[PDB]
């Protein structure tokens, strides 16, 4: 039957019961030993309350805010004598403040994004740099430096960011094998970075194609997606952002860097969900993706950075998202950006409203001796329905990663603040793999210069096909 | 008891029996009186043959080519007893050559596009300038200068190009009436140009939104559209092209002009169907359109040019297409450009496969004292089904414009080569209006700087919202 990995001894407080909370609850119930009365869900929504009541789970209908979070969460995180687990799956809440609260009260923590308090983004005097995921991430790195060790808190452990960090490692191992590079698999960050450098990985796309299709035609003035509409829109309006590789020789005139921090990233002064890049996945083959900002674009490039004695980077891969969302979401973006406003209404596709499709989510490592290698999941909606309730394929990749992260945290409860790149990738993938459908690695001869130049002249660098100059779509 | 407009005392030869041919034939049968055996349809397609045969239509299965066109068409067009009519609704045939042949033999002619012989649109030595609609239109204008007068031949009389030229004239009249710039209705080209100048019309979008939705999901690797896929892809891969107004103070670095010809146009060194512009229609409100090249963009701007004594343009409007095609075609374009190749298959939406929706097609005159005014048709699929068989709402707007052009040519059969702009707009709209559903004029306060600048800096011109600099999408 289903494996039970650990006993949870304290309260489980799930913040948020949207598409991911709903998918994660049944996995938590399935894979951990605890009395159900120990778990409670907090979410302000009436729809969420109704679903919770049908599922027989404790529910508190409240919005967690900067003004109430200490008063509200401390009693819940500290109920009884066991160590609790805060599972944060919300929007509009500060990941940093909640995480720090959990740690100071001895509870484990996990989330899937570095989220700021409601109001952060539409503040009048917020500079574009301050709206970046690089800056949000630096607040978490800062917290780690300020309080080393202590109770484990896992930042950004969803599908992406999260799982894709584990795929990068598995892909590096596979590439090393296929290129005839033999030796000890790496066990430290410095060794992972050197492996990437040695293999000649110039960069990495988080290369995703969602083919889930709805049982109804897209309504006008409704934003449709397979996961958070609020979350997608929020990240889509942040600056286009990327981990910036040492091999790059060109950047747009509207690119900018950062004065402080780890140094791994740049951003563009334009929204990521309206920025296209040339990418590839096995089912899609050549496609456009959107350059949406994501924590892993920075965290993976930072993680795989090799520095010299002086502390300067000698190697770092480029890393960014190349997202082709579901058809209705592509239409929803076209509608949003063309109108200049958010749609009147929105909805997230339920599994019962999906006629077919997969969430093809993987990592595309390029520039090495086999040109490009894609490693990841081809999870279908049909498989998802069989193996995990109350979610679509997009949801299951995320919720199963949260599960893997929780397993790791309970097995390593005094690791301090950690990112998915800090977790044991094999253990995490061992826990996750049952929920990923086919996981495959395939090589391709495709490059961003495929079929170029064509009818019209373009600004391309023919000496090096993988340069960002060739990837970025100039509109 | 639909009205009959004219007797036709000679052969009617329809070249092409695709989406438009299938919608046009029943209107011809409805509105003209002729020996029914005098009509014949020529198309190489097996699908076209089976359709025609199941309806008792006289059919020749052949491709009209550079090699066979004289031998094939002369006998059909001159079969008598009186003057024939060549109705060209094909792809991959030369409009110019067929039109000149019909004229040499005294047959009336009509088409909906200036099309070249097969093979034109890919050459080792075809410069982008020579692929432009401006250049193709210059061959028609040259033909007219070469042989003035004679038998009427109507160039580019579909919905757009075609009907929209009549809409521009009606809109100019309406604007004037609303603003009391009233007087004699213009009767000459120069008077129309001066009315546009006196109203302060800085430019015109052919502003279209197709909301027809398919009853089936978007198939992978199939291009879907509501009219010719071959035709749409062809124009979509031509350079983005526009009539270029005297008020414009900026153009892209990749813009180019022409050494000769009417002087009314420029082109961009990029594909039109991958070029976005900010536009507006009544149902969509603010939307993106694609800057797809079209004959009317040049013909309307040329028609409304005012010249001083020396002969240089002192006034001309900007004019271009701002096309939001149906949801499935938007996705088809994203797929084609992202993949860098044409899909393996294609499908035109039949009326029976459309859930609901309209083809909202009009002209948006901007820059004048009332900011912006949209005039056009909001024909629904439901109304289309009640009034005309075998077509969707896109098709009916085109087929009814061909009907109107045919009526005009029969009424004025010695007018020489003529464009839509040369026809009597009131008579054509009288004929066409029963097939257009609601035809409305709407003012708006929208401009291309609505909501700008916003979260990010952009190169905009705040002194004049309507500058192309502000319309063109440059992320
Ligand atoms: N790493 C990844 O792979 C990944 C993937 C998907 C989603 N996400 C992120 O995970 C989070 C959840 O995604 P989702 O699809 O479930 O979103 P969702 O929009 O479906 O649900 C969000 C929930 O948060 C609740 N909420 C809003 N404000 C709150 C508050 N102040 N306190 C408590 N709850 C509040 C809402 O009522 C809602 O039920 C989002 O932040 C999203 O960006 C990450
Ligand atoms: N002005 C406008 O508003 C407008 C609107 C729609 C279409 N169009 C144009 O009208 C034309 C027809 O459109 P459609 O939607 O019917 O296209 P379609 O692609 O449905 O049909 C084209 C037909 O032409 C036939 N054909 C191909 N090669 C031929 C040849 N060598 N000789 C004879 N026939 C040949 C094909 O077999 C096909 O049946 C196209 O050129 C299109 O671009 C103009």
């Amino acid at each position: 039957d289903w494996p039970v990995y650990h006993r949870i001894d304290g309260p489980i407080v799930m913040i948020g019961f949207g598409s991911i909370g709903r998918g994660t609850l049944p996995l938590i119930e399935r894979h951990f030993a605890f009395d159900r009365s120990k778990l409670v869900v907090i979410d302000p929504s009436d729809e969420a309350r109704k679903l919770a009541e049908a599922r027989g789970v404790r529910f508190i209908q409240q919005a967690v805010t900067r003004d109430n979070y200490r008063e509200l969460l401390v009693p819940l995180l500290t109920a009884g004598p066991g160590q609790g687990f805060c599972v944060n799956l919300s929007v509009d809440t500060s990941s940093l403040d909640i995480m720090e609260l959990a740690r100071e009260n001895g509870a484990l923590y996990i989330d899937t994004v570095v989220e700021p308090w409601l109001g952060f983004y539409f503040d009048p005097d917020l500079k574009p740099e301050a709206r970046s995921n690089y800056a949000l991430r630096e607040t978490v790195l800062a917290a780690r430096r300020n309080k080393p060790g202590g109770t484990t808190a896992v930042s950004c452990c969803g599908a992406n960011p999260g799982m894709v960090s584990w795929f990068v490692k598995q892909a590096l191992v596979n590439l090393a094998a296929d290129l005839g590079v033999t030796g000890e698999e790496p066990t430290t960050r410095e060794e992972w970075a050197r492996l990437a450098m040695d293999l000649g990985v110039k960069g990495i796309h988080i290369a995703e194609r969602d083919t889930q299709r709805a049982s109804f035609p897209k309504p006008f003035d409704v934003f449709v997606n397979t996961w958070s509409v609020e979350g997608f829109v929020s990240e889509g309006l942040q600056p286009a952002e990327l981990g910036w590789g040492t091999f790059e020789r060109w950047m747009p005139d509207n690119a900018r860097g950062h004065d402080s921090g780890c140094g791994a990233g740049i951003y563009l002064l334009q929204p990521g969900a309206n920025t296209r890049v040339r990418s590839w996945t096995p089912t899609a083959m050549a496609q456009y993706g959107f350059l949406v900002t994501h924590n892993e674009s920075i965290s993976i490039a930072d993680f795989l950075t090799v520095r010299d004695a002086a502390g300067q980077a000698v190697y770092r891969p480029t890393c960014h998202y190349a997202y082709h969302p579901c058809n209705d979401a592509v239409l929803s973006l076209h509608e949003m950006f063309g109108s200049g406003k958010r749609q009147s209404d929105w909805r997230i596709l339920d599994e019962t409203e999906i006629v077919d499709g997969i969430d093809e989510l993987g990592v595309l490592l390029y520039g090495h001796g086999k040109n490009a290698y894609w490693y990841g999941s081809q999870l279908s909606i049909e498989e998802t329905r069989r193996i995990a309730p109350d979610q679509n394929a997009t949801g299951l990749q995320v919720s199963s990663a949260v599960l893997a992260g929780m397993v790791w945290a309970l097995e390593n409860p005094n690791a301090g603040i950690v990112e998915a790149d800090d977790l044991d990738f094999r253990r995490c993938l061992e826990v996750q793999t049952p929920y990923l459908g086919p996981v495959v690695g395939v090589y391709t001869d495709w490059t961003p210069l495929a079929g170029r130049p064509g009818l019209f002249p373009e600004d391309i660098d023919t000496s090096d096909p993988w340069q960002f100059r060739n990837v970025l779509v100039r509109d």
Side-chain angles (χ1 to χ4, degrees), chain A residues 378-408:
Chain A
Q378 303 180 310
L379 182 66
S380 74
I381 187 63
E382 286 84 10
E383 179 149 12
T384 296
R385 288 183 185 122
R386 289 294 312 197
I387 70 186
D390 297 326
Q391 60 202 304
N392 64 39
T394 302
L396 183 53
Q397 294 173 334
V398 181
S399 60
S400 66
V402 171
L403 169 71
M406 294 179 65
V407 173
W408 188 90

Side-chain angles (χ1 to χ4, degrees), chain A residues 73-90:
Chain A
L73 299 174
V74 171
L76 300 173
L77 291 172
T78 58
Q83 176 165 59
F85 213 136
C86 179
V87 183
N88 187 12
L89 305 174
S90 61

Side-chain angles (χ1 to χ4, degrees), chain A residues 353-388:
Chain A
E353 305 170 324
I354 294 165
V355 305
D356 51 48
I358 74 173
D359 195 327
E360 183 164 85
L361 173 50
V363 301
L364 180 71
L365 284 65
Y366 59 82
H368 49 77
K370 291 174 77 71
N371 180 58
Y373 178 71
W374 189 99
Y375 189 80
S377 169
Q378 303 180 310
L379 182 66
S380 74
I381 187 63
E382 286 84 10
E383 179 149 12
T384 296
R385 288 183 185 122
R386 289 294 312 197
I387 70 186

Side-chain angles (χ1 to χ4, degrees), chain A residues 72-241:
Chain A
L72 175 60
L73 299 174
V74 171
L76 300 173
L77 291 172
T78 58
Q83 176 165 59
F85 213 136
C86 179
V87 183
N88 187 12
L89 305 174
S90 61
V91 298
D92 294 339
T93 61
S94 173
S95 298
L96 181 71
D97 290 344
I98 296 171
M99 172 184 89
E100 286 180 337
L101 186 70
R103 304 221 310 139
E104 88 185 22
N105 290 98
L108 303 166
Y109 175 94
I110 187 154
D111 67 30
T112 60
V113 59
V114 186
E115 185 82 347
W117 290 116
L118 174 64
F120 175 79
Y121 288 121
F122 50 72
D123 187 273
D125 44 311
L126 261 216
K127 309 98 182 70
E129 206 250 39
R131 292 198 329 115
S132 69
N133 282 334
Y134 178 105
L136 289 166
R137 174 163 181 269
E138 287 299 327
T139 71
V140 176
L141 308 186
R144 178 159 71 185
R145 283 194 303 267
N146 181 256
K147 298 188 208 161
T151 304
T152 298
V154 189
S155 179
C156 289
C157 193
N160 54 324
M163 174 189 70
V164 296
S165 285
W166 314 328
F167 287 171
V168 172
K169 285 181 171 90
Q170 185 65 60
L172 285 171
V173 169
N174 292 357
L175 260 184
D178 298 340
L179 280 163
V181 182
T182 62
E184 272 189 332
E185 172 171 311
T187 54
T188 64
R189 177 198 86 71
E190 293 69 25
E191 294 168 350
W192 280 108
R194 283 226 161 256
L195 175 59
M197 179 183 187
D198 292 345
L199 292 172
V201 176
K202 293 172 175 271
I204 303 170
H205 288 179
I206 310 306
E208 183 171 10
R209 172 59 168 277
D210 186 340
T211 71
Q212 290 168 109
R213 299 185 305 174
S215 57
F216 53 87
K218 184 190 171 293
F220 178 85
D221 197 22
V222 174
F223 196 116
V224 177
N225 200 21
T226 54
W227 62 281
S228 187
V229 167
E230 283 168 356
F232 189 30
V233 172
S234 186
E235 70 182 30
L237 296 173
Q238 288 175 269
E241 197 164 0

Side-chain angles (χ1 to χ4, degrees), chain A residues 29 34 126 128 182 196 295 329 334 402 425 439 459:
Chain A
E29 289 174 335
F34 62 95
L126 261 216
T182 62
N295 183 86
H334 186 74
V402 171
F425 82 100
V439 177
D459 175 26

